């Protein structure tokens with residue numbers, strides 16, 4: 001079964017680490033880096049890793065039951081899976097699938113629709129934020145702590161968190177949270193990735209997301225877009241080597257813009273060619289060319 | 302080129318009319334209906350219709366500039382992908398626009414690009430009443446309302462929908478995309494079962510609500526992944542009707558069968574005021590090209 005990439009253009013793709021369209025391709029203009037995101041992790045032959053799940057509108061969302069305590073009001077959410085199934089902390093995952101995979105304050109909206117009590121069917125929704133550095137950000141153990149200026153939430157009812165953007169200018173998108181809290185190490189992580197040779201850089205799909213105040217840039221970079229995650233998962237094409245050579249092509253003219261290594265683990269490297277911003281034709285997309293190996297030498301893009 | 306469907310299960314699919322996962326399959330328990338949604342419209346050979354665009358998180362979003370300022374927020378629109386919006390495009394409205402009558406609540410946000418505080422941001426809850434006379438996304442403008450006056454005129458502004466802003470949704474009643482003046486144009490066609498005893502099968506989401514008892518139902522004809530799939534595959538339709546079966550991949554058992562119409566919607570044979578029970582690992586599979594005379598087994 002031949003390996004293929006979606007034929008969606010850049011403006012037609014979704015970030016796999018935040019619910020947002022892709023705004024541009026991006027390489028670090030300073031140096032090469034090492035990164036270990038847990039959303040947006042899929043091997044070329046279709047193996048999901050980390051906390052990666054398939055629904056683009058559920059990335060960095062949470063679902064569960066509000067548990068009352070004992071100006072910002074604390075909201076302890078006892079989690080279930082995003083698809084509604086019970087959350088099992090013994091699963092071999094770093095945290096509930098879809099959990100926020102970086103240190104920062106994410107603002108969003110928490111909503112409820114009552115299923116028990118004297119007001120079944122009554123609803124409410126308000127802005128909240130989740131600080132993933134909080135010691136009670138413990139999505140591996142099955143709970144997260146939100147905060148809201150509103151006290152208008154009902155104890156014991158189904159509660160959903162939908163992320164919107166930066167709730168403070170404090171994002172560190174490549175620093176993993178402590179998914180089990182302060183006294184347990186992360187486990188079952190998708191591996192760290194980095195260029196294997198000097199002169200290469202990871203190529204990211206970058207989104208710029210909203211911010212609720214301050215001057216935060218809102219950058220969230222993913223290794224492959226969510227549509228690629230969905231595509232590889234369904235195709236499950238055998239990988240014929242550790243490295244697929246791909247090219248950004250203009251499908252209307254056949255012109256090759258630049259080449260890149262698509263690693264079997266599910267990320268892209270390019271040859272460094274300076275701090276120049278990346279400009280591609282808006283009708284262009286990546287196309288699989290051939291299976292190669294690590295000794296392939298990329299031409300500067 | 303052979304026609305295929307994605308193999309994603311129900312809990313792995315996205316609504317094409319609202320940014321939400323699919324919760325269940327649904328048919329009208331009362332009668333057959335006629336519907337004309339403008340998002341989630343793609344023919345089986347990959348022709349997008351209505352206001353349908355490809356990005357699942359952008360459905361019912363708006364992007365634009367705040368021109369002037371419950372505090373009113375007048376937004377001059379661009380396309381969601383950032384390109385200028387041309388009101389003479391042969392579309393009912395800017396792609397992704399809300400395609401029903403109701404109050405949609407969400408968050409409006411800004412990041413300044415001009416003036417004395419370039420880079421400064423803000424974001425607050427807002428709502429958009431698509432029955433408002435100034436809900437005119439075809440002309441290129443929408444009116445939002447917010448409790449906060451912390452918004453900057455002349456700056457890029459984005460609306461992200463969350464759910465019901467009031468218990469006033471009519472998901473099958475199209476808004477007046479140009480206001481009370483002009484009739485709607487360039488609409489994706491109405492769809493309905495062609496025979497008594499058939500019903501449209503919907504992919505249903507239950508979305509949030511900011512107060513009241515609204516049900517939050519948003520039904521789409523095909524999920525957004527199917528839209529994306531048909532758009533890319535562009536497989537020629539060999540007949541007006543593809544036979545599809547909802548299958549259990551573990552057992553190979555056909556749970557039920559359905560007609561997938563070339564226009565991009567599904568009908569099933571009515572089997573009474575039946576709740577729909579399907580296995581969580583199941584998905585639809587293309588079986589064969591048939592025709593309108595195919596008799597579906599009652600669901």
Ligand SMILES: C[C@@H]1O[C@@H](O[C@@H]2[C@@H](O)[C@@H](O)[C@@H](CO)O[C@H]2O)[C@@H](O)[C@H](O)[C@@H]1O
Pocket residue numbers: 212213214215421422423451452
């Ligand atoms: C840059 C501004 O950000 C927000 O305002 C801030 C307030 O929310 C508050 O945190 C105070 C405390 O220092 O700082 C303000 O800058 C926005 O509300 C405002 O419109 C600006 O974008």
Ligand SMILES: C[C@@H]1O[C@@H](O[C@@H]2[C@@H](O)[C@@H](O)[C@@H](CO)O[C@H]2O)[C@@H](O)[C@H](O)[C@@H]1O
Pocket residue numbers: 122123124152511512513514
């Ligand atoms: C069912 C309830 O809805 C909301 O409360 C409403 C208020 O926000 C306000 O609109 C008043 C107007 O009279 O009506 C209330 O019903 C929720 O905030 C509340 O928690 C209930 O779910």
